[PDB]
Amino acid sequence: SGTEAETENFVHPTGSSRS
């Protein structure tokens, strides 16, 4: 969804429900 940063999904931001 969108995505702009380096990835915004690895371990911390990983998640679509809440995150």
**Distance (Å, rounded) from C-alpha 19 to C-alpha 8?**
11
11 to 3, 16: CA distances (angstroms): 15, 12
**Distance (Å, rounded) from C-alpha 2 to C-alpha 5?**
10
If DSSP states are collapsed to H, E and C, what string results for the chain?
CCCCCCCCCCCCCCCCCCC
Rounded to a whole number of angstroms, the CA Rg of the chain reads 8
Reading the block at residue 3, the tokens are 């995505």
Method: NMR
Specify the amino acid at residue 17: S
**Distance (Å, rounded) from C-alpha 9 to C-alpha 6?**
9
Reading the block at residue 5, the tokens are 């940063």
Kindly report the length of the chain.
19
